[PDB]
């Protein structure tokens, strides 16, 4: 399996045109407390393709 391509599964907010982001900071969908830690409702940035 060439699992070598990522796809930014759920990013912070909607993307402007022709913009690129490489920031892999942990995204939080529930509560704010988690700062740079993948907690209960704080998932790691991108995905890995299959």
């Amino acid at each position, epitope marked *: *399996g060439n*699992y070598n391509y990522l796809y930014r*599964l*759920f990013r912070k907010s909607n993307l402007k045109p022709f913009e690129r982001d490489i920031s*892999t900071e*942990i995204y939080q*969908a529930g509560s704010t407390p988690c700062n740079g*830690v*993948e*907690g*209960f*409702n704080c*998932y*790691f*940035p991108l*995905q*890995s393709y*299959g």
Partner: antibody
Amino acid sequence: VQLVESGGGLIQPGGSLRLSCAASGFTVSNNYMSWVRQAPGKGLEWVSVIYSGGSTYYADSVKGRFTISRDKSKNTLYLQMNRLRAEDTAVYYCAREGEVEGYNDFWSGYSRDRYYFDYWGQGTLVTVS
Amino acid sequence: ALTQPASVSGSPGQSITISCTGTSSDVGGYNYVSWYQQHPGKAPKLMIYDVSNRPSGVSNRFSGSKSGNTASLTISGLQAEDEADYYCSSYTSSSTRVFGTGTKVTVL
């Protein structure tokens, strides 16, 4: 989805042992990977879990002695066991967590949480003596 | 930790309930209680997840629920294959996962 394990066997207390869990059909970074052991003829004890990236979470019975790791290139899950003890005698399973949108109940979308266990490994015997 | 009855028993045809009492942190607070079935010599199998839900490809007789700090696995219509131990795995409450003591069911 397949999960094969290897590396367990006879070992003396205080030594070192590194376990392996090669995963085909998915990655050690797509969904959460967790180690769970079962003492001979006993219950299930969650050992540790590594998230999709940046997590080294363990149990209080194995903190400071076990460290969980992975190799993205070889797509294998590893578990270092240092300073083994007699109460660590068990068969160890590597369990993949729930993929995002498991069985897709068409109501909730892509929130990774889905905290449960998907298909397991075969398990390898670890006898500390 | 999670406490379970060490064993339950019943006859084919009827239903059996299985309890699992825990704290208000994981079962009473969170909603990711799961259930598994492990035959002797086989790896466990996901029976119930997301509480009320059930994974597809599984007999529809299996059913689960949780009332406060107590979880419940209500198996219905026991057959001969159901003979195995069942573990209740709730959510973790900050990434220290837990499992029940196990309930070995015996079908008459």
